[PDB]
Amino acid sequence: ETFTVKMGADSGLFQFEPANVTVHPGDTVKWVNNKLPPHNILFDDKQVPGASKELADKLSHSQLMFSPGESYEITFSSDFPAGTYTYYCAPHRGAGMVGKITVEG
Ligand SMILES: [Cu+]
Numbered sequence: 001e002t003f004t005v006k007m008g009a010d011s012g013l014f015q016f017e018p019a020n021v022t023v024h025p026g027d028t029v030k031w032v033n034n035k036l037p038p039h040n041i042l043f044d045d046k047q048v049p050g051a052s053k054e055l056a057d058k059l060s061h062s063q064l065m066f067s068p069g070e071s072y073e074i075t076f077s078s079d080f081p082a083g084t085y086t087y088y089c090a091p092h093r094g095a096g097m098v099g100k101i102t103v104e105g
Contacts, residue, residue, distance in 0.1 A: 002028040002073075005099065007065070007089070008035030014092035016099035023076050024104050030073040031061075038064035039089045039097070041072060047086035059085065076103050 001024070006017040012035050021029055031041055040063065045056035059080075061072040074080075082105030089097040 002030055005029060005031045006034035007031055007039040008033065008037070010035060012036050014089065014095045014097040016089070016097060019099045020102070021099075022102040022104060026075065026077055028073050028075045029101055030071055033065055033068055033070045037068065037070070038066045038091060040064050040091065041087055042090055043085055043087045047084070049081040049083035049085070055081075060087075062090075064091070076101070 003021045003023065005021065009015045009017055014036070016031070017034070023029060033039060041061040043056035043059045045051060045053040048056050048059070059074055065072065080103055082103050085101045085103065087099050087101070091097075
């Protein structure tokens, strides 16, 4: 299954929509610019399994995404451990543009 996460609500609010997604092994999460770019996707290294900086860096898209409809995706296959993965947008972190992926096992 592929889950689409919009970056920016239709109203312009600085939110990932939906903010919380639960995935099963082999599923894909695809982030897509919706409103008021740029956004980016940074995983919090203290809030992924093992509190691993390597894992957080692997999953992040640190480059700002300026283009309408620009996308980034992750397929949660076996090199991704079970657990929750918290992420944020650096431009809008202060305003609470945050999300969480729960990887089931
Ligand atoms: Cu953002």
